[PDB]
Design a protein around this ligand. Structure first.
Ligand SMILES: CCC1=C(C)/C(=C/C2=NC(=C\c3[nH]c(/C=C4\NC(=O)[C@H](C)[C@H]4CC)c(C)c3CCC(=O)O)/C(CCC(=O)O)=C2C)NC1=O
Ligand SMILES: CCC1=C(C)/C(=C/C2=NC(=C\c3[nH]c(/C=C4\NC(=O)[C@H](C)[C@H]4CC)c(C)c3CCC(=O)O)/C(CCC(=O)O)=C2C)NC1=O
Ligand SMILES: CCC1=C(C)/C(=C/C2=NC(=C\c3[nH]c(/C=C4\NC(=O)[C@H](C)[C@H]4CC)c(C)c3CCC(=O)O)/C(CCC(=O)O)=C2C)NC1=O
Ligand SMILES: CCC1=C(C)/C(=C/C2=NC(=C\c3[nH]c(/C=C4\NC(=O)[C@H](C)[C@H]4CC)c(C)c3CCC(=O)O)/C(CCC(=O)O)=C2C)NC1=O
Ligand SMILES: CCC1=C(C)/C(=C/C2=NC(=C\c3[nH]c(/C=C4\NC(=O)[C@H](C)[C@H]4CC)c(C)c3CCC(=O)O)/C(CCC(=O)O)=C2C)NC1=O
Ligand SMILES: CCC1=C(C)/C(=C/C2=NC(=C\c3[nH]c(/C=C4\NC(=O)[C@H](C)[C@H]4CC)c(C)c3CCC(=O)O)/C(CCC(=O)O)=C2C)NC1=O
Ligand SMILES: CCC1=C(C)/C(=C/C2=NC(=C\c3[nH]c(/C=C4\NC(=O)[C@H](C)[C@H]4CC)c(C)c3CCC(=O)O)/C(CCC(=O)O)=C2C)NC1=O
Ligand SMILES: CCC1=C(C)/C(=C/C2=NC(=C\c3[nH]c(/C=C4\NC(=O)[C@H](C)[C@H]4CC)c(C)c3CCC(=O)O)/C(CCC(=O)O)=C2C)NC1=O
Ligand SMILES: CCC1=C(C)/C(=C/C2=NC(=C\c3[nH]c(/C=C4\NC(=O)[C@H](C)[C@H]4CC)c(C)c3CCC(=O)O)/C(CCC(=O)O)=C2C)NC1=O
Ligand SMILES: CCC1=C(C)/C(=C/C2=NC(=C\c3[nH]c(/C=C4\NC(=O)[C@H](C)[C@H]4CC)c(C)c3CCC(=O)O)/C(CCC(=O)O)=C2C)NC1=O
Lengths: 160, 161, 58, 158, 160, 158, 160, 158, 158, 160
């Protein structure tokens, strides 16, 4: 959270929250209702966003679901769609929490070597996440789209 | 020792994790590779990282933070209640960076590691006798910490002292 | 932000001689932060070392 | 560490589900009380010296034996340690008040504090009396927003 | 400033600015206009605020200007009022910067040792800064008063 | 480091004066363009991997001799060091774009880079060519908004 | 003590007592009788030393006992004179030990923070301690006064 | 650590009083015996090598099974560690003798020594036997001056 | 560092001879002046805060430009550092007075101080004026006992 | 010296000389005439002491001057006597300094590996220094003999 990050900085320096930390927390608390609105819209349309993202990613890379592909098979395609759903949920978490920590502890620390061991092609994951981002921006207004795109782009960048 | 070995050892000693597990300190690593900074400077760069406060202070009591600091930067454990208490007071009134700076500037650090060696444990009585208030207790605590080095013990710090 | 590069020769007279390589400790130039300038200045003086050069690049 | 929002996120993630209406209501309640909680936290921060002064006076007027020789607060050093511990309690109470959650008190403060005090011979009942005095002093200033965090410290210590 | 703090945090971790850091910078940039008007009010009435704060402080503690007091004498009293002017200008620097780094760099680091050596009573300085905060709040609206009071209280807290 | 606001603060402090009308106008100008500079920084950050990719492509197509054996970019290690240097330049140019001041580039990029590159044998003209190619790519991606900081790196190296 | 200081010096280097440390211990053991006499004289006249010191300090700085002073009131005046009595007792302790470790461990460590929080004027404490130094120097011969003045001056210097 | 004078000071400070006649008598008593203890400690320091040689000889003539293979004193390294431990005991008995108090032995030596010896497999009764042998050797040279400190070490190990 | 006795020892060791009568005379005169040197050192120690206060007051009354904005003594930090330097000079002059030699000043104060002051922009002539003011203040208290060491500092800086 | 060590202790803690260190320095200055007398006697009888000690050492261990010994031949025997002269001069230095540092830096630090490389028997050196002890004590008074034998003991212990 923004609050957790500010408090951890104060605690590590053994001091009360500074005027800048207080202003950060005030800004986050002021943005709370907008964050909740965006997160609610994303959570209500999770199935549509993931279904469209998977369609777009498999259309752009038919080799994934072709024989010999990483996602080939019912169980593997299920796991791929499940990962897309996971990343969408984590983006909603980041939007609510006002920082990238939930996305880090839950889904981005160790994902690189995880996907490396399983030979999961990271460009395909990035394509799926960009597809999810576009599906989401379709549902959100321009300002809400920008807010959600911050965390979508963070996930994309952390994958690469 | 090459810079690669020293970097791997530094991350293993200070953050107890492999370099691939972390977000590496690129610029500090490049400065150490260019000879601009010493190994000790890279060690304080590691101790100064936000990841250090997240690993060793965020969810721990100040006694645990002190034991972490001693293990990481001195290669031993706090032996007395005076030493542990002074370090805890430093963490609680001056911050983590000041306490780590105290540990690195202490004559013990220069004597054992100087400016070019990663800290390590030395389970010898010469390690503690001149340096520590209770050398035998220091040996016992350091040997226990070494014997179960993989573990992050949850036994209260003042229980051990 | 400002930093200082300091060049010092620290002799090893007080210590005994050792077969280990020690030339890197005797003569050095190191980059330090300003907040660290006084502690290492006094530390070098404590050990019998001589401050050969001080520079601030800017 | 954890605040209220991270607590809700962790709960939903452990259930492996998206936020639902109830979780959104809970997080909106957090955002609603946040501004009052920052006002209380800033007031405590600005007046921390006065709070420590009043609470130490109240403690050592209640229990004069602590300051007399043989007492646990008898020296300049032991008195400084005592007021330092009260400073810790107030600072971490402010952290918990901003976070809206008491887990920071459990992790950074309470865990190991009982053993520290038993090892040093700090009288825990008197420390709880000091925490209660601080709770009264702070409540006289900000209202009743920090009462639960001082009560948490007191229950954890006793 | 607020921007410098975020950039230093990002650079220490050798990364680009995170979405949370972007929100911090954005909130500072949005707050810029009210910071400018608060600092303009404080600066344009600096003589009035310093004069009133000095009057209140010397009425509260007449011993400062009594014989044997630290502020006794025309030179010492004048340069006491000079210190109050210094601190008000530093508070304006804080209001503009969005953090307390200008205050610490120019006025707070070393003031404890300075005042300890020169016999300057910190409680008197705190009363002076409190009076200055009241003078400023008289000139400001309640919101602007709180905005400046953040940095006034930070300076007082650094004193004590 | 320094931003524009801290630069104005330091200029006013060197004269020991409060802000005047001119200083407030400069601060207002800095706040006026802040949103566009944040947008450019976010666009650069979202496309850092690509920007770096075609920047390296432009550098090593304009000078293929660097990659050939005997060149300063000939190894996996030296190629990775080259790419890391260019990524440094992009990240610090983005920092200066947000800050509105070239102080971070001077104190933490340009300072000492010239003698480091001569002591390493790094070809400074080729590095300047790389910085200019990355300036071209970034200008095609966000416009002329970040040109100044790239020219600052290029002039400091040259 | 002097002996303890020599023993820690030897223990730090993991060696037996040096000829220098042996000389130090022998000097302390020879000085013991003079030290006992000085400490006895200070301890027997403690009451009048403290009373005269308090009188001198209060006449020098009557602001302490004026309304709003740190020592105003019977209770606070008694606390002030109690602190003077404390410091005299620690001066005797340091005369007996032959060094200043008892003084530091009982009375000086934490006193800066204690008096800073309580807003006790350290310069006023220093006036009181210097007053006690003159009061005791009146009671002692020239050599004994010189012996005790070392510890009085040490306490004063450790104040500021 | 403590010596006798600091012990008296700490007692009187615990009652929070000035030194009385009894305290002065008890401290002049310590000043009285300082010369004998200094002379004995200097004698021990002068002949430490001979005392260590004779004490190790006595211990291993009493218990030759330690030197045999599988004994805790069988190797060059473990033999050296054993003689180094006896040298520690001698030096800290010298410190206690000068100090006049056994505390330096209590925290410097005894604190954690049984745990060390049980974790290392060192036989504690054999170490007590070596301490007693060293006690006899030191007594033969300096009288009964160090018997209490060696007995303190032995009883703390036992 | 080395004192006068050690300096004579080193000079006798340079030509590898025992002390002659002149060496013993030098040692005897050092021991003769030692008591007055100790008295002066104690006087400076007891009055270090006041000596520092009127020394800084003299320096900044003579040169008000330093304290004005843009001066090297203008900030809280920079004024504190200046006074800390003056306290350094006073304390190391006292050390030199006790040791009876100027080696401590040469090796722990003057060594690397030109380079430091030129790197930071400290005005060396103004520091020398401050050292002269401190010399006068000290001579007002202890007389001419320690002019040589302040003169050594000034000439090492001048 | 004792002065040098006291000043180094004071500099280690960035303070002026404490009453204990001032007492140590005063004790060193008081003992100056006795130290000078002892050193003068040891220096005047240097040839006598070295000849007596060398003769005693060679008689006790004739294998040193026996064929194949480390000191066989007039050149090697001369170097042995020269070493005894060196160590006696170092003992005089230690007497004059009041501490053992001149002995350590000039002759003691590095002599162990020097004698290991030269295959000098350290027991032989120890018996030679003990012989010098008895010769010197025969020329000094009992108190002076003890004072110089402190440093003789230091050298003997350091060799072993
Ligand atoms: C809540 C946080 C979380 C994340 C993010 C997560 C990712 C994740 N995906 C996994 C497997 C997988 N992940 C994928 C998905 C990838 N492969 C396809 O080609 C696509 C390019 C791409 C998805 C867009 C696939 C196909 C597998 C199975 C591969 C295998 O069995 O080796 C695994 C290994 C364990 C398992 O099989 O379930 C993890 C840990 N797990 C988590 O607990
Ligand atoms: C592994 C590479 C390496 C080298 C080459 C090296 C040389 C070296 N020699 C040193 C000292 C010394 N070296 C010598 C030897 C010289 N003087 C004599 O006249 C001889 C003619 C000559 C040797 C044949 C001496 C006498 C000193 C001590 C000088 C002093 O510090 O006062 C020192 C200072 C550290 C110390 O005193 O132990 C270094 C660094 N160190 C290294 O780590
Ligand atoms: C044995 C070692 C020891 C020392 C040294 C010591 C000092 C000491 N003085 C205190 C309060 C005090 N100290 C003073 C003394 C000041 N009044 C005037 O300003 C004078 C300038 C000055 C004295 C010369 C006063 C009046 C108080 C009580 C009022 C307050 O809370 O500030 C306190 C806080 C606890 C209390 O109220 O009693 C301590 C710990 N306590 C110790 O246990
Ligand atoms: C941030 C969380 C945190 C806490 C809470 C904390 C408590 C704490 N208190 C301590 C000592 C102490 N604490 C006290 C306070 C007691 N004196 C009594 O009269 C009072 C009733 C009571 C206080 C209200 C005292 C007197 C000591 C010194 C004990 C001693 O050294 O004998 C110590 C040992 C370090 C030292 O000596 O200063 C700790 C770690 N530390 C932490 O890091
Ligand atoms: C954050 C600020 C920062 C900068 C700017 C920086 C530059 C930098 N580049 C370096 C190496 C290098 N830099 C390059 C780049 C060059 N190769 C040529 O082909 C190209 C024309 C050109 C780049 C466009 C190369 C190849 C090396 C490796 C040189 C070697 O190992 O011999 C080094 C030496 C240490 C290391 O290899 O990590 C530094 C310090 N380091 C920093 O910490
Ligand atoms: C398995 C590993 C191991 C080794 C190597 C070892 C060496 C060793 N030899 C010893 C005694 C001895 N060592 C020797 C041998 C010396 N006599 C001549 O001078 C020669 C120069 C030289 C041998 C070539 C002698 C004569 C003794 C008994 C004399 C004494 O008490 O010192 C001792 C002392 C304990 C004892 O009395 O046995 C040890 C520890 N001990 C071990 O447990
Ligand atoms: C200053 C107080 C102090 C003491 C006393 C002390 C004892 C001590 N003895 C140790 C090992 C040892 N100690 C002994 C001594 C035993 N051998 C037996 O024959 C004898 C009965 C007995 C001695 C008379 C031995 C053999 C070891 C090596 C054990 C091993 O490495 O397995 C160790 C482990 C570290 C090392 O190897 O140096 C310690 C800490 N440490 C201290 O800081
Ligand atoms: C811009 C940053 C800055 C600050 C903050 C600053 C404070 C400051 N005030 C000083 C002196 C002084 N300051 C004061 C202030 C007053 N004393 C009264 O008791 C009042 C309680 C109090 C103010 C409310 C006084 C009286 C002096 C004269 C002290 C003396 O000359 O001994 C000094 C020593 C140099 C001088 O005499 O001018 C500094 C450095 N200087 C700076 O460059
Ligand atoms: C114990 C030996 C020792 C000495 C001698 C010493 C001098 C010294 N003075 C310094 C800075 C300084 N020194 C001064 C003093 C100057 N200001 C002018 O107005 C005056 C004329 C003049 C003093 C009389 C100032 C202002 C600075 C700070 C400069 C800056 O921060 O930019 C620094 C840089 C490190 C720091 O600021 O913490 C050193 C090392 N340090 C030591 O450890
Ligand atoms: C001032 C400090 C100092 C010391 C202490 C010192 C000792 C010393 N003695 C040496 C040689 C020697 N030293 C000795 C003396 C030893 N061998 C005999 O057997 C005896 C057991 C014993 C004397 C009691 C001998 C015989 C040599 C000749 C070795 C050779 O030339 O091969 C050497 C090697 C260079 C030389 O030939 O002089 C040193 C350094 N030199 C110094 O500058």
């Amino acid at each position: 959270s923004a609050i957790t990050k500010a408090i951890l900085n104060a605690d590590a320096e053994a001091r009360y929250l500074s005027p800048g930390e207080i202003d950060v927390v005030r800004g986050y608390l002021a943005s709370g209702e907008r964050r909740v609105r965006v997160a609610r819209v994303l959570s209500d349309n999770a199935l549509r966003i993931v279904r469209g993202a998977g369609d777009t990613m498999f259309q752009k890379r038919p080799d994934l679901v072709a024989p010999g592909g990483n996602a080939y098979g019912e169980v593997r395609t299920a796991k791929c769609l499940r990962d897309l759903d996971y990343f969408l949920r984590l983006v909603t978490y980041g939007v609510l929490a006002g920082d990238t920590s939930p996305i880090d502890e839950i889904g981005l620390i160790g994902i690189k070597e995880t996907y490396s061991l399983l030979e999961v092609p990271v460009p395909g994951v990035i394509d799926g996440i960009k597809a999810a981002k576009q599906q989401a921006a379709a549902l959100l207004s321009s300002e809400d789209a920008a807010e959600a795109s911050f965390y979508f782009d963070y996930v994309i960048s952390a994958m690469s | 020792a090459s810079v690669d070995q020293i970097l791997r050892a530094s991350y293993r000693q200070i953050l107890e994790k492999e370099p691939q597990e972390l977000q590496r300190l690129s610029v500090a690593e490049s400065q150490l590779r260019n000879g601009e900074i010493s190994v000790k400077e890279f060690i304080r760069a590691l101790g100064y990282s936000e990841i250090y406060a997240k690993f060793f202070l965020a969810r721990w009591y100040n006694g645990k933070v002190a034991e972490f600091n001693f293990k990481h930067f001195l290669g031993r454990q706090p032996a007395s209640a005076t030493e542990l208490g002074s370090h805890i007071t430093l963490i609680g009134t001056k911050g983590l960076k000041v306490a780590i700076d105290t540990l690195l500037a202490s004559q013990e650090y220069q004597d054992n590691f100087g400016d070019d060696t990663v800290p390590y444990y030395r389970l010898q009585a010469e390690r503690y006798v001149g340096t520590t208030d209770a050398p035998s207790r220091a040996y016992v605590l350091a040997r226990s910490r070494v014997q179960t080095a993989l573990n992050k013990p949850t036994v209260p710090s003042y229980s051990l002292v | 932000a400002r930093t200082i590069s300091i060049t010092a020769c620290v002799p090893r007279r007080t210590k005994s001689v050792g077969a280990s390589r020690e030339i890197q400790n005797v003569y050095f130039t190191k980059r330090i932060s300003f907040d660290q300038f006084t502690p290492e200045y006094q530390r070098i003086h404590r050990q019998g070392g001589t401050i050969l050069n001080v520079q601030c690049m800017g | 560490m954890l605040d209220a929002v991270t607590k809700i996120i962790n709960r939903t993630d452990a259930e492996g589900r998206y936020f639902a209406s109830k979780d959104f209501d809970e997080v909106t309640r957090f955002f609603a009380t946040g501004e009052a909680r920052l006002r209380a936290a800033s007031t405590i921060s600005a007046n921390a010296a006065s709070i420590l002064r009043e609470s130490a006076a109240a403690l050592f007027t209640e229990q004069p034996d602590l300051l007399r020789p043989g007492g646990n607060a008898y020296t300049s050093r032991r008195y400084a340690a005592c007021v330092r511990d009260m400073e810790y309690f107030l600072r971490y109470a402010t952290y918990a008040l901003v976070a809206g959650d008491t887990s920071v008190i459990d992790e950074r403060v309470l865990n190991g504090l009982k053993e520290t005090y038993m090892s040093l011979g700090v009288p825990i009942p008197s420390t709880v009396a000091g925490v209660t005095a601080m709770k009264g002093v702070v409540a006289s200033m900000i209202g009743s927003e920090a009462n639960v965090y001082f009560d948490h410290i007191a229950k954890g210590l006793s």
